[PDB]
Design a binder for these strands. Structure first.
Ligand SMILES: O=P(O)(O)O[C@H]1[C@H](OP(=O)(O)O)[C@@H](OP(=O)(O)O)[C@H](OP(=O)(O)O)[C@@H](OP(=O)(O)O)[C@H]1OP(=O)(O)O
Ligand SMILES: [Cl-]
Ligand SMILES: [Zn+2]
Length: 187
DNA sequence: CCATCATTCGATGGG
């Protein structure tokens, strides 16, 4: 029902250009005997609650906003689900975000998590430890390529019929990030 | 409250 402005998608998911915000598009699928049935009702997008020192508020990261909304998803404890995130920045360690996602996965063994990041959040000096902790908790940690960007455009954006138009350098940036993520996950 | 930055889950500066 709720779709993202095209300008907001192309300004926030560009994998060579940073913004001072995080968007997270999410999709939930049920895993059956062999198959997976797509649950169109369980998809949407959100962004971080911005830091706001006028109120003494040091923000709430997009990943923790997703954990906040999990109860409202009303996932049946008797079924197994795969959650996919398409997140403009990779999850941080230093605010405790990777830790809470790990705790979530340990507490909810019927939920399998897949994360595709557009960009690596290395402003956090412990960014490697975040990506390794999520992998160690059983999350698939990946870089967004053309296929994931095009899927997010097609699925989450208010395109009004406009096909995905890849930005210059999309493939080159995806490959370079893919190489940085592989070196981090080798250990 | 915006505007800027060729913008790292905002920091500044101007009014
Ligand atoms: O079932 P297929 O023959 O592979 O059709 C695919 C498939 O459609 P769905 O998204 O409806 O399943 C792609 O998604 P995947 O299942 O392969 O992940 C989709 O890509 P988007 O998710 O990017 O929209 C793609 O694109 P489109 O619907 O734009 O044609 C479409 O067709 P093609 O792969 O033949 O282009
Ligand atoms: Cl985070
Ligand atoms: Zn965080």
């Amino acid at each position: 029902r709720h779709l993202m402005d095209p300008h907001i998608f192309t300004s926030n998911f560009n994998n060579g250009i940073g913004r001072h915000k995080t968007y997270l598009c999410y999709e939930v699928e049920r895993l059956d005997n062999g198959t997976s049935v797509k649950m169109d009702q369980h998809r949407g997008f959100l962004h971080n609650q911005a830091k706001n020192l006028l109120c003494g508020f040091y923000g709430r990261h997009a990943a923790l906003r997703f954990l906040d909304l999990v109860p409202s998803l009303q996932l049946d404890p008797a079924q197994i689900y795969r959650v996919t995130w398409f997140i403009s920045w990779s999850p941080c360690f230093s605010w405790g975000c990777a830790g809470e996602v790990r705790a979530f996965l340990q507490e909810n063994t019927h939920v399998r998590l897949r994360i595709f990041a557009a960009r690596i959040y290395d402003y956090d000096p412990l960014y490697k430890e975040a990506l390794q902790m999520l992998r160690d908790a059983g999350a698939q940690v990946s870089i967004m390529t053309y296929d994931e960007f095009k899927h997010c455009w097609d699925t989450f954006v208010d395109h009004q019929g406009c096909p995905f138009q890849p930005w210059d350098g999309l493939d080159e940036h995806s490959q370079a990030l893919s190489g940085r993520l592989r070196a981090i996950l080798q250990n």
